[PDB]
Design a protein around this ligand. Structure first.
Ligand SMILES: O=C(Nc1cncc2ccccc12)[C@@H]1CN(S(=O)(=O)NC2CC2)Cc2ccc(Cl)cc21
Ligand SMILES: O=C(Nc1cncc2ccccc12)[C@@H]1CN(S(=O)(=O)NC2CC2)Cc2ccc(Cl)cc21
Ligand SMILES: [Cl-]
Lengths: 298, 305
């Protein structure tokens, strides 16, 4: 029993965190094999012009108490790749993956190449993440673990004026219409991740919270007409299919749970909570619910 | 900016998790140096749990009855002893991944990270607090026994909790790493129930100071309170009494934001009376009590917005 915002064990990622210094700027890098990946803004813009003026010895890379020697450098999109003389003996099995809005991941927040905390979050529909980051956190990474393989999906680059965060995949492509520079940028209007709220409602039913269930069912079309009015993302047939297993475990059809969600949007919770929350939670995917209510290990 | 329920990086603890098997029971153990620590109920059957005599069950066991698996390697048990509700298994190999560590017993209100494990394999990490009723609101399934709670302030891991059981309300009970239970619980399947829980007042105040640091003041008012008047009101909402120790502990957050502890207590009194009126505080529509004053100082900026 119980339901917590659970992150993946961070050990495999901790063994890859390093400190990268270029002039006056210090941030975090990810050391995999003989390459250190970090945000290109460490050299700060005309990034090619700024980079051509730097030599290998201008980049100071520190792994624990050891100084790594930079023997090459190149840029890939908004990520700087520093070739080092030493391969990371702690390099786990890994892949670089680009995630979609709604998908969740764990963040290992780091400062000066030293991990300070781990938390779980989701890529919002507006491509920002509601993280917890201070100055020096740039280069901190987001990831998932599937079996023994770490899938790196996010690298932190910046904080927007509303306090939310923006970054790139590990190939340097930003999530969202953001650019790595000081200019007027703002998060777009966000929406609620509908398939995730439904997954969390199924988790509540698995945990014994059933007060919100009703005898009614709805159609996908009627549900989406209602959901669009509360700034909820449209629910697709793919989302309905993805919720199939949770629907079979609890005996509540997806459009049956949509009728429950419809009533919660129109009438509120009326002083009640669901899994200890007075808000409808959208940062647990259907897969996160299945994994936490099954005990999958790494 | 931002405020998340943040856990400590779990790597130092992951390298200590092992699987302990005794007959048909399999659970988790913590391997530090040449000793594996695990709940003593690993020696019990389900029938035994009603009224187990651990001393009688243990005397019938030899070292080779305990199977300890660390990754893909079988460790050899060369000794065993019981200390309160934990079993200590001496093994023939010291853990090369043993971090710098201490065993610490925490008080209600204190927070810690939990590395939930099954079959000696870590599955997830989450942050939680020792409730005033000595239970923890964890997320644990069958096989999670022996999973541990810890803090890692600096490079040293302070182990404070080992998971033993789930109570009828779905909350969890366990021991410190010396085998002493938190709360009036026994590692026996008898009529046991969590006492009525209360809200950790000093933690809610800390979280209100975190909201001020991150730039939000809508909940403040022009009033103050005496400590006694605050406690008379707080106890009506099932909030723990606020002591002078708690007031002293909130001193640094009070100096950083410029808001006296008793003025923040006045704001809390008003929030309890009025609710939030459609508003949120740090993305929550409830008053959060699982962040200590120390956690707020660790996570939040040193400069108020
Ligand atoms: O955003 C960035 N860093 C951070 C990242 N995360 C959490 C921070 C918290 C507190 C201060 C910085 C933080 C950096 C530096 N700054 S800044 O001048 O500090 N303005 C930020 C407060 C809004 C602009 C900037 C511009 C472009 C790029 Cl790619 C990076 C960045
Ligand atoms: O509680 C225990 N295990 C668990 C521990 N944590 C989370 C669990 C979730 C789901 C199932 C087990 C879980 C064990 C086994 N059980 S039991 O028969 O499974 N009853 C509990 C569910 C209410 C009695 C018992 C009694 C005393 C002691 Cl010391 C240990 C234990
Ligand atoms: Cl304590």
């Amino acid at each position: 029993s119980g339901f917590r915002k659970m992150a993946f064990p961070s050990g495999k990622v901790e063994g890859c965190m390093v400190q990268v210094t270029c002039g006056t700027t210090t941030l975090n890098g990810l050391w995999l094999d003989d390459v250190v990946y970090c945000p290109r803004h460490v050299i700060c813009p005309n990034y090619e012009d700024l980079l051509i003026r730097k030599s290998n010895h201008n980049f100071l890379v520190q792994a624990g108490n050891v100084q790594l020697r930079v023997i090459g450098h190149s840029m890939q999109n908004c990520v700087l790749k520093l070739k080092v003389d030493t391969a990371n003996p702690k390099t786990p099995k890994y892949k670089f993956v680009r995630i979609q809005p709604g998908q969740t991941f764990s963040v290992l927040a780091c400062y000066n190449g030293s991990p300070s905390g781990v938390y779980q979050c989701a890529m919002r529909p507006n491509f920002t993440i509601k993280g917890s980051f201070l100055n020096g956190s740039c280069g901190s990474v987001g990831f998932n673990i599937d079996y023994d393989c770490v899938s790196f999906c996010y690298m932190h680059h910046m904080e927007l004026p509303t306090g939310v965060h923006a970054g790139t995949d590990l190939e340097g492509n930003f999530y969202g219409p953001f650019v790595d520079r000081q200019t007027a940028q703002a998060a777009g209007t966000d929406t609620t991740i509908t398939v995730n709220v439904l997954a969390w409602l199924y988790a509540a039913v698995i945990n014994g919270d059933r007060w919100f269930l009703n005898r009614f069912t709805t159609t996908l079309n009627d549900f989406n007409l209602v959901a669009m009015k509360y700034n909820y993302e449209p629910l697709t047939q793919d989302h309905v299919d993805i919720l199939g297993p949770l629907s079979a475990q609890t005996g509540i059809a997806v459009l049956d749970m949509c009728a429950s969600l419809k009533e919660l949007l129109q009438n509120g919770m009326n002083g009640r909570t669901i899994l200890g929350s007075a808000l409808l939670e959208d940062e647990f995917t259907p897969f996160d619910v299945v994994r936490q209510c099954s005990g999958v290990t790494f």
